[PDB]
Amino acid sequence: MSLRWYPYPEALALAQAHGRMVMVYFHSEHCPYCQQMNTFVLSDPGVSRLLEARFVVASVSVDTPEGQELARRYRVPGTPTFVFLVPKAGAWEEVGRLFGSRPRAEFLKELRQVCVKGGACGEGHHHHHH
Numbered sequence: 324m325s326l327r328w329y330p331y332p333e334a335l336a337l338a339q340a341h342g343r344m345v346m347v348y349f350h351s352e353h354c355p356y357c358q359q360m361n362t363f364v365l366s367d368p369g370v371s372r373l374l375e376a377r378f379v380v381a382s383v384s385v386d387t388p389e390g391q392e393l394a395r396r397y398r399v400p401g402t403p404t405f406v407f408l409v410p411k412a413g414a415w416e417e418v419g420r421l422f423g424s425r426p427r428a429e430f431l432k433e434l435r436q437v438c439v440k441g442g443a444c445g446e447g448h449h450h451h452h453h
Contacts, residue, residue, distance in 0.1 A: 325368075325375075326371045326374050327375070327378075327380055328381075328382040329379060329380065330381065330382065330383070331390075331393065333381075334346070334380065334381030335379075335381070335408070335415070337379040338379040338410050339410050342410075343410075344378045344379070344410070344437070345407070345408035345410065345415070346378045346379065346407055347405070347406035347408060348380055348383060348403070349394070349403070349405075350384060350402045351385040354401020354402040356401065356403065357402035360425070361403065364425075364427045364430065365430075367427050370430060373435065374434070377441070385401060385402070397417075403421070403423075405420060405422070406420050407419055407433075407437045419440070421433055
């Protein structure tokens with residue numbers, strides 16, 4: 324495999340033990356909205372390269388108990404649901420969620436933003452009214 328798609332437990336463990344970031348990818352076959360983007364846009368070598376760099380991707384099935392549970396916990400629809408979690412100090416930080424597939428342009432925007440969010444999340448010192 325090229326990009327690393329591990330189960331939710333492993334993805335968190337790999338990230339935690341290797342100082343990486345977590346990409347929680349919620350997928351369902353009952354939500355066929357992702358299959359269009361996932362195949363081309365998400366499997367894009369450019370996109371995948373940003374994930375390979377610092378991310379551990381969690382392939383979670385929303386229709387099965389663990390995904391069902393996470394759907395209760397995080398409150399998630401079908402697919403594609405991208406939840407980015409950063410391991411910092413000793414806690415997991417959700418830096419945002421992407422839903423609606425989007426073109427890789429917008430996806431890479433957030434994928435790059437999250438790349439910064441890993442250390443930039445927690446900002447608010449420099450207040451802004453926009």
